[PDB]
């Protein structure tokens, strides 16, 4: 399978590319296949610190046998960096800045995280879901909280693998309507339902996965959007709980649920490494 | 007219005390009367800078002939301060910490600003409105934006003067239910009607005064509450526009209206000086 | 009686001068006498911020009818300052730097606080003791804790007024040997006794005043010097408790004693005002 | 003699106004005349700290019987400030910003110091020179160093009083051509000669006043522009040395000269107060 | 032999384990043996930056063929870290925090330094002592200074290999009585003696090693504990001088001794690398 | 050819050593040669951050198969570092401090950049010029801007390969006369000519390479020293434009030229890597 040069948005992967990437991630993780980026160097440019993201990308590159380095107009820094390293994993606020790097770098650019999307988190999430249910299509994912970057990637990711998704948020914090429309377009072709709503318990109905993230009056506004025992009980019988981290116990989730038997948060976190190894191999391999 | 020792909340004043304070303010402003705090010192304790609040309080004391000074458990600092100065104008975050100083100070304490209320700002606003319509009772005030500290004082103040008030705030940014309840409790005995709405135009229609403050997805949630030409045209023909300041042109208000012939912002700002002179004379006199 | 132009060390005043100063402070406080510094300005140059010291000096000058201003080689800044204001209350770390200012300023310099001494605090303490015993000579004062700047000024001050003093501190926290020797030399002619000890209960035995200050392993080294009920019971029946402030309840003193009937801490703090009015009038008069 | 509302640049004063101001400064200094701004408040807004400047302005207002206070689009800040205080002394970097304030304040604005000029310093200098030589016109002033803000105000000041002036600076550090051109234009009417040169000895030849300020490679560049014994030897017999302070001994001036008998730096420094009193009285009187 | 999973305290190693560790360190150093941690990654979590500690740990892992990465409730970050890396070397303040990591990480944890202990430093010191004397048991080590983290590890380390130890510190800065008691308990079985004294000269007598570290009145309190030619002269004829670094010449040691022929400070420093390679190999191997 | 232990100044390489280095870099770049520093660690001590320098040095060492680590009196830190790593690439401000390290480290020290020189940059530039004209001798290099560290290294470097160099700078920003003298002395034996001029259009006439860097009143001094279309037109027809970066478009260079067809800036930047690999190989080989 051929991949586009960069991974700036999950929408850079069509259904075929995403499934190929997910299969590779599984194979690499299980030792069924091996990849190597020996002699290659991954550059990390985070306009904002993120140890979590730095360590997962770095160990991922080390296990591929490569090296890593943590790192004026962007076109200048991008062009020179394109002369030293072989890949760039970058975190910036503006999706547009990320795109400028990809435009001048001359080497593969990977979205480590922007205000708009977080493609790698969701590839790791899809990985975790598949390992828990032995499938992705037909499942239902309920995301409660702020319609943010992870919500955006989830909308695209779920739709691309035929998974239904219900995104429940407070009135003024809905996901970008253009992304939700893009996700519906995709879902129409994979047989999935895409829903953007207000009530979390309605989104949770029948959900196999409950997903949340940190919240952006604060209390009154998001309080109902918390994955707790009540939300869990109202979801599919074998529901699982995901959270991209870090978590604020008492806000979007309870300690009880987080430390509960339905939590797959730690496996989800590990998969960040396995997912990113697949992308690094697919784009730099 | 006996006033309570401190002015922590606008509710420390009954309808009579408020009107008395307002009358005193008017007279002092027009020289129709004279006060003198010579020999006394006003201590300012702002846990959060506020040049605007500091300058209006300081000049207010100077015109009364007093002096000013800008300034471990609060009980300790408050007791020692009560031995050096004769009054405290303080700005804290918690309304309780303010009550803390008031409890141990042994000298009058005035709320210069807290997360919960802004009494002095409203007395100023009531003064400005009075000067613009020759009355307060029967008028309708419409507040749009975040249900914050000034909205709280506005509710209590308007009610106490027989001024009807309609506060329109976004979904999860409603005024504290307890203050609005209390305002309605006062409204019934004064003849004004307290409305807490969601729709800004509903509140502005018929309004004699359009009032707004700075806002707490951000845009998505506040755009409709901006006071502009469209909203102005809805209120009374001779409606006035107030804004406690500082203002963000383009958000809660437009440059057009702010610099427009309906704006009373600058006179409103000046009345902070006269309003506070009245509060200082009343409690330290 | 005539005073040296400055007050850098309590040793700047001999027996006659310190008594003259205390008498002036008493009369000023009772109004038995009056002073005036109208047209004069006091410059406050505090290298280290201190609201407690700032407020007492500023109100002190205000009650004398003067003004106040809160504030490169020191000889340059001192000579220029000496051309604008009429006196400086300065707080530095090094006694030497303080003397630097006094040498070039050309106007009276007062030690608002240095690592080495705190003469104004003690003048206020002596006033407080006098207001509780009707005399100074013959009394016994016990200082427990760290032999710091206040302890130094107490050694000198007590010695000069015929008050016996016992300072109890941990092994390596004794007061400057040179100040102790100088105090003993003064006491030798005033009939006072000077004791630099290790045992707090020994020092407190029959003391008329129990004095402590904030402390400089730390716990397991000062814990025994805490003025609590037990230590108070070792003191004379009419014993008084002083603390220059701020206080750390649970450490050098307990809330019980601090808030108890033997405490004169708040009168002591107020006396900083009356004490400083005395020095300002005496040096700037 | 009527004065323009503000003093943003020394050019805001024509020959008549500058002379009336110096005369008033002298009269007030000698007590030959008295002025009062009782009831008025001077606002100080220094975007850049400047103790020397803050103290000289504050004592100036105090001696005039007024009060002073130390203190978002500037047009808002200025308009509200204009409702509380009676005058503003501001120190900023950009001259335009200063003009923004003057445009919106509605009250007198005085340039406490900007990157472009330092008028109050030069009125103090002119006052000092007048007291030393008994006149101003016909005298010659040599300024050596960086063509900065004080250099600009000196070019204007000297020209206006008919004092000839020679400013020697390193090639790329000449003063603003526009101010020089403006100074030459003024000098034509007053019979003074303006010279912008390179060689400091040429500039100092027959000068009655040697003036310097702090400099901006750097050493070799400004090294020769130092007022030392040698430079002083090329100037007039009764030559005096001025320096606006602070000074960097060893660079623009030597300790020997600075502390020598030809120095009038401290008198010059004190005249800031007397000059500023005249500016306050003249614009706020 | 077998080792406990973590090295949080030197007491985590019984006599056989410490010796096995010292032996391994020596063999790795002389190349008499080899080891590698290829494909493994060491995570560094230093809550208090330490470049010297970071470089020694990082180069140790590199020479073992592994990689290194420098890196919310601790239990959350520990569990996530445990899914990415194979070992953690951490620097915290609280020993208990260090224990939190070990409990949740799921991978070996090494104490890179805490307020309570510094085991890796002591293993390095032991290696150094052994190389200089050809043995450990029967020797006498004198530690002078503050009874801190290294003193605690020295107490346990020394007793464990049969080395007698005398720790001299000021009255209030003695080592944790519990570690001393534990060390004396171990010494009873190894034939060594443990002494906690006050006098540095008494401690240093007959000592083969003089050891000090940065100190916590300051001078008056610690001065006597300084290791200088005088103290060195009281030690055994072949006495060596150790210091964990960094050093403050003039305080705990003099430049003279530190640069003298009896100093083994640099070899001790180098051994940080050799001792740490041994712990990494032993716990991650 | 044998090299000295360090590369602190370009003058540490005679003409013969410079060519060998340049040849090694080229061979390494084209794969006509292969070096390896396996088992070695390079430490980077940058007293001033420089991602540009850090990345070029780190990827260089990685391509040689070694490791890299980014890292109190210098003599202590140098001695300890010398026990852990095998080489130091360091960035300081003073050349003297750089020498301190080399003196005590006991391991090869490379000048990553100092206020005085930038050797590695120049070896990269030389290698770039060579790749563009197939020769170095006979060619002419014109530098315009501030006579800084790179100008200094270009002077020594150009002369050493027989390349004529003309350096144009404003009057007070000329190259260190000592390096110009030393450059001329070298040129005397290589047959190249060295010129320190004021006019940039003079220096550029007949140049095959126009070189500039960021500039040190600032504009009206460096303004005329911009490499633009006009300046280019005055040089040889096959003229190349070099800039060590970062660049300030509109100041020392125009976007047009930087982005134009004569620019070799990006190739020049990549060559920092190939040049540094040659130094690392040569000095640590």
For residue E259, which phi and psi values (nearest 5 degrees)? -100, 0
Q: Which residues of F touch D173 (CB under 8 A)?
A: 217, 221
| F199 is an annotated ligand-binding site residue | no
Q: Which residues of B touch D69 (CB under 8 A)?
A: 54-55, 58-59
Resolution in units of Å: 2.1
Catalytic residue flag (residue A91): yes
Chains B and E touch each other (3 or more Cβ pairs < 8 A):
no
All residues at 6 or more sequence positions from F223 whose CB lies less than 8 Å from its CB, including other chains: none
All residues at 6 or more sequence positions from E13 whose CB lies less than 8 Å from its CB, including other chains: E3, E4, E7, E21, E160
Distance CA(E217)–CA(E32), nearest Å, equals: 51
Chains that touch F (3 or more CB pairs under 8 A): A, D, E
The residue behind tokens 């010659």 is D140
For residue C112, which phi and psi values (nearest 5 degrees)? -80, -20
Contact F71, E55 (CB under 8 A): yes
Q: Which helix (H) or strand (E) holds E143?
A: strand E140-144
Ramachandran area for residue C129 (φ above 0: left; ψ -120 to 50: alpha; else beta): alpha
DSSP 8-state symbol, A176: P
- Token pair for residue D254? 């030597």
Q: Which residues of E touch C217 (CB under 8 A)?
A: 146-147, 172-174, 216
Please tell me whether residue E153 adopts helix, strand or coil conformation. Answer: helix
Q: Which residue of A has its CA nearest to B146?
A: A217
Q: Where are the alpha helices (DSSP H) in chain A?
A: 15-30, 51-63, 74-84, 95-105, 119-133, 149-160, 177-190, 200-204, 218-222, 229-233, 255-258, 265-284
In total, chain E counts a number of residues equal to 285
Distance CA(E32)–CA(B90), nearest Å, equals: 73
DSSP 8-state symbol, B249: B
| E119 is an annotated ligand-binding site residue | yes
- Pick from A52, A9, A8, A50: nearest CA to A153: A9
- Pick from C247, C263, C271: nearest CA to C56: C271
Distance CA(C135)–CA(C115), nearest Å, equals: 30
Distance CA(C94)–CA(C115), nearest Å, equals: 6
Chains that touch D (3 or more CB pairs under 8 A): B, C, F
Q: Which residue of D has its CA nearest to B268?
A: D80
Please tell me whether residue A32 adopts helix, strand or coil conformation. Answer: coil
Q: Within 10 A of A30 (CB to CB), how many other CB atoms are there?
A: 9
Distance CA(A280)–CA(C196), nearest Å, equals: 73
For residue A197, which phi and psi values (nearest 5 degrees)? -140, 180
Distance CA(F142)–CA(F130), nearest Å, equals: 16
| A158 is an annotated ligand-binding site residue | no
- Token pair for residue B165? 């008030």
Q: Which residue from B55, B245, B249 is facing D69, i.e. has the nearest CB?
A: B55
The string of DSSP letters for chain F reads ----S-BSSGGGS-HHHHHHHHHHHHHHHHTSS----TT-EEEEEESS--HHHHHHHHHHHHHTT-EEEE---HHHHHHHHTTT-SEEEEE-SSHHHHHHHHHHH-S-EEEEE-SS--HHHHHHHHHHHHHHHS--TT-EEEEES---HHHHHHHHHHHHHT-EEEEE--TT----HHHHHHHHHHHHHHT--EEEES-HHHHHTT-SEEEE------HHHHTT--B-HHHHHTS-TT-EEEE-S---BTTTB-HHHHHSTTB-HHHHHHHHHHHHHHHHHHHH-
- Pick from B152, B167, B144, B140: nearest CA to B253: B144
CA-to-CA separations, D55 to B67, C84, D7, E87, in angstroms, rounded: 19, 7, 19, 61
- Pick from A162, A122, A105, A150: nearest CA to A271: A122
CA-to-CA separations, A216 to A96, A151, A169, B222, in angstroms, rounded: 21, 13, 11, 16
Ramachandran area for residue B257 (φ above 0: left; ψ -120 to 50: alpha; else beta): alpha
Q: Which helix (H) or strand (E) holds E184?
A: helix E177-190
Contact B270 D79 (CB under 8 A): no
Q: Which residue of A has its CA nearest to B175?
A: A217
Distance CA(C149)–CA(C139), nearest Å, equals: 22
Distance CA(E66)–CA(C208), nearest Å, equals: 71
Please tell me whether residue B102 adopts helix, strand or coil conformation. Answer: helix
Order of strands, sheet of B109-113, starting from the edge strand that comes earlier in the sequence:
B67-70, B41-46, B87-91, B109-113
Please tell me whether residue A224 adopts helix, strand or coil conformation. Answer: coil
Q: Within 10 A of F20 (CB to CB), how many other CB atoms are there?
A: 16
Fold of A121-271: Rossmann fold (3.40.50)
Q: Which residues of C touch E220 (CB under 8 A)?
A: 172, 174
Distance CA(D270)–CA(C82), nearest Å, equals: 9
Q: Which residue of F has its CA nearest to A41?
A: F59
Q: Radius of gyration of chain C from Cα atoms?
A: 18
Q: Which residues of F touch E59 (CB under 8 A)?
A: 41, 67, 69, 84-85
Ramachandran area for residue B28 (φ above 0: left; ψ -120 to 50: alpha; else beta): alpha
Half-sphere exposure of D115 (CA within 13 A, CB side): 10
Q: What angle do CA E50, E55, E56 make, to 5 degrees?
A: 105
Contact F217 D172 (CB under 8 A): yes
Which residues face A42 on adjacent strands?
A68, A87
Distance CA(F55)–CA(C109), nearest Å, equals: 57
Please tell me whether residue C70 adopts helix, strand or coil conformation. Answer: strand
Burial D265-283 (b: 16+ CB within 10 A, else e): bbbbbbbbbbbbbbbbbbb
Q: Which helix (H) or strand (E) holds B25?
A: helix B15-29
| D53 is an annotated ligand-binding site residue | yes
- Pick from F280, B53, B214, D247: nearest CA to C73: D247
The residue behind tokens 């009880």 is A256
Q: Distance from D84 to chain B by nearest Cα, in Å?
A: 6
Ramachandran area for residue A57 (φ above 0: left; ψ -120 to 50: alpha; else beta): alpha
Distance CA(A226)–CA(A244), nearest Å, equals: 14
- Token pair for residue D22? 């110096």
All residues at 6 or more sequence positions from B156 whose CB lies less than 8 Å from its CB, including other chains: B9, B10, B11, B122, B179, B182, B183, B186
Strand segments, DSSP code E, in E181-264 are 194-197, 209-212, 240-243
Method: X-ray
The residue behind tokens 């960086």 is D146
Distance CA(F282)–CA(F6), nearest Å, equals: 10
| D272 is an annotated ligand-binding site residue | yes
- Token pair for residue D15? 């020959």
Distance CA(D211)–CA(D145), nearest Å, equals: 9
Residues of E serving a catalytic function are 91, 118, 121, 213, 244, 272
Taking each helix axis as running N to C, give the angle between helix A119-133 and helix A149-160, from 0 to 180 degrees, rounded to the nearest 10: 50
- Pick from D262, D269, D213: nearest CA to D235: D262
SS (H, E, C) chain D: CCCCCCECCHHHCCHHHHHHHHHHHHHHHCCCCCCCCCCCEEEEEECCCCHHHHHHHHHHHHCCCCEEEECCCHHHHHHHHHHHCCEEEEECCCHHHHHHHHHHHCCCEEEEECCCCCHHHHHHHHHHHHHHHCCCCCCEEEEECCCCHHHHHHHHHHHHCCCEEEEECCHHHCCCHHHHHHHHHHHHHHCCCEEEECCHHHHHCCCCEEEECCCCCHHHHHCCCCECHHHHHHCCCCCEEEECCCCCECCCECHHHHCCCCECHHHHHHHHHHHHHHHHHHHHC
Q: Give the best residue of E28, E37, E269, E272 to mutate against chain F (max F CB count within 10 A).
A: E269
DSSP 8-state symbol, C140: E
The residue behind tokens 């970097």 is D93
- Pick from C241, C194, C248, C242: nearest CA to C216: C248
All residues at 6 or more sequence positions from A219 whose CB lies less than 8 Å from its CB, including other chains: none
Domain B1-120+272-285 is of which CATH architecture? 3-Layer(aba) Sandwich (3.40)
Contact B185, B15 (CB under 8 A): no
Strands A41-46 and A87-91: parallel
Number of H helices, E strands in chain B: 12, 9
- Token pair for residue A154? 């989830």
Taking each helix axis as running N to C, give the angle between helix A51-63 and helix E74-84, from 0 to 180 degrees, rounded to the nearest 10: 20
Q: What angle do CA E216, E217, E223 make, to 5 degrees?
A: 70
Distance CA(A70)–CA(D34), nearest Å, equals: 69
| B51 is an annotated ligand-binding site residue | yes
Distance CA(A104)–CA(A119), nearest Å, equals: 21
Distance CA(D245)–CA(F85), nearest Å, equals: 50
For residue D142, which phi and psi values (nearest 5 degrees)? -115, 120
Order of strands, sheet of F209-212, starting from the edge strand that comes earlier in the sequence:
F194-197, F164-168, F140-144, F209-212, F240-243
Please tell me whether residue E23 adopts helix, strand or coil conformation. Answer: helix
- Token pair for residue F53? 């320098």
Distance CA(E206)–CA(E191), nearest Å, equals: 17
Give residue limits of the domains in chain B: 1-120+272-285, 121-271
- Token pair for residue F72? 């109190």
Q: Is the dihedral of CA D83, D89, D93, D96 positive or negative?
A: positive
Which residues face C242 on adjacent strands?
C211
Distance CA(E57)–CA(C48), nearest Å, equals: 41
Looking only at Cα atoms, what is the longest distance across chain A?
54
Distance CA(F161)–CA(F138), nearest Å, equals: 9
Give yes or no on whether C1-120+272-285 and C121-271 have one common fold.
yes
The string of DSSP letters for B105-170 reads HSS-EEEEE-SS--HHHHHHHHHHHHHHHS--TT-EEEEES---HHHHHHHHHHHHTT-EEEEE--
SS (H, E, C) E97-124: HHHHHHHHHCCCEEEEECCCCCHHHHHH
Report, in this order, helix, strand and coil percent for chain B, each rounded to 5. Answer: 45, 15, 35
Order of strands, sheet of C164-168, starting from the edge strand that comes earlier in the sequence:
C194-197, C164-168, C140-144, C209-212, C240-243
Which residues face F195 on adjacent strands?
F166
Report, in this order, helix, strand and coil percent for chain C, each rounded to 5. Answer: 50, 15, 35
Q: Which residues of E touch A59 (CB under 8 A)?
A: 41, 69, 84-85
Q: Which residues of F touch E51 (CB under 8 A)?
A: 71
- Token pair for residue D251? 């660079």
- Token pair for residue D57? 């302005």
- Pick from C214, C248, C269: nearest CA to C55: C269
Contact D269 C83 (CB under 8 A): yes
Q: Which residues of B touch C247 (CB under 8 A)?
A: 72, 76
Q: Give the best residue of B116, B151, B171, B174 to mutate against chain A (max A CB count within 10 A).
A: B171
Q: Select which of F91, F152, F182, F274 is catalytic.
A: F91
Which residues face C197 on adjacent strands?
C168
Chains that touch C (3 or more CB pairs under 8 A): B, D, E
Contact B207, B235 (CB under 8 A): yes
- Token pair for residue C179? 């100040």
Q: Distance from D278 to chain F by nearest Cα, in Å?
A: 33
Contact C86, C38 (CB under 8 A): no
Distance CA(E142)–CA(E155), nearest Å, equals: 10
Distance CA(B140)–CA(B208), nearest Å, equals: 5
Q: Distance from A169 to chain B by nearest Cα, in Å?
A: 11
Contact D8, D53 (CB under 8 A): no
For residue F234, which phi and psi values (nearest 5 degrees)? -90, -5
Distance CA(A16)–CA(A19), nearest Å, equals: 5
- Pick from E125, E115, E96: nearest CA to E18: E125
Order of strands, sheet of D240-243, starting from the edge strand that comes earlier in the sequence:
D194-197, D164-168, D140-144, D209-212, D240-243
| A234 is an annotated ligand-binding site residue | no
Q: Which residues of D make CB contacts under 8 Å with F?
A: 146-147, 170-173, 216-217, 220-221
Q: Where are the alpha helices (DSSP H) in chain C?
A: 15-30, 51-63, 74-84, 95-105, 119-133, 149-160, 177-190, 200-204, 219-222, 229-232, 255-259, 265-284
Contact E12, E282 (CB under 8 A): no
Distance CA(D83)–CA(D105), nearest Å, equals: 8
DSSP 8-state symbol, A142: E
Catalytic residue flag (residue D244): yes
Contact B273 D84 (CB under 8 A): yes
């Amino acid at each position: 399978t051929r991949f586009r040069p960069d991974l700036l948005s999950l929408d850079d992967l069509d259904e075929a590319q995403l499934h190929a990437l997910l299969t590779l991630a599984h194979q690499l993780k299980r030792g069924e296949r091996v990849a190597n980026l020996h002699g290659k160097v991954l550059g990390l440019v985070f306009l904002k610190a993120s140890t979590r993201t730095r360590v997962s990308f770095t160990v991922a590159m080390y296990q591929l046998g490569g090296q890593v380095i943590d790192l004026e107009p962007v076109r200048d820094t991008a062009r020179v960096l394109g002369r030293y390293v072989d890949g760039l994993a970058i975190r910036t606020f503006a999706q547009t800045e990320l795109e400028e790097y990809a435009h001048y770098a001359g080497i593969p650019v990977i979205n480590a995280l922007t205000d708009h999307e977080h493609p790698c988190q969701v590839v790791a999430d899809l990985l975790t879901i598949r390992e828990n249910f032995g499938r992705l299509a037909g499942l239902k994912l309920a995301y409660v909280g702020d319609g943010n970057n992870v919500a955006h990637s989830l909308l695209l990711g779920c739709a691309k693998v035929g998974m239904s998704i219900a995104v429940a948020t407070p009135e003024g914090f809905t996901p970008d309507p253009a992304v939700s429309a893009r996700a519906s377009e995709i879902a129409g072709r994979t047989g999935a339902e895409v829903q953007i709503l207000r009530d979390p318990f309605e989104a949770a109905r029948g959900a196999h996965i409950l997903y949340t993230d940190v919240w952006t009056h604060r209390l009154q506004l998001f309080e109902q959007y918390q994955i707790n025992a009540a939300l869990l009980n109202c979801a599919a019988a074998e529901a699982i709980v995901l959270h991209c981290l870090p978590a604020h116990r008492g806000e979007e989730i309870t300690d009880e649920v987080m430390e509960g038997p339905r939590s797959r948060i730690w496996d989800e976190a590990e998969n960040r490494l396995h997912a990113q190894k697949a992308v690094l191999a697919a784009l730099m391999g």
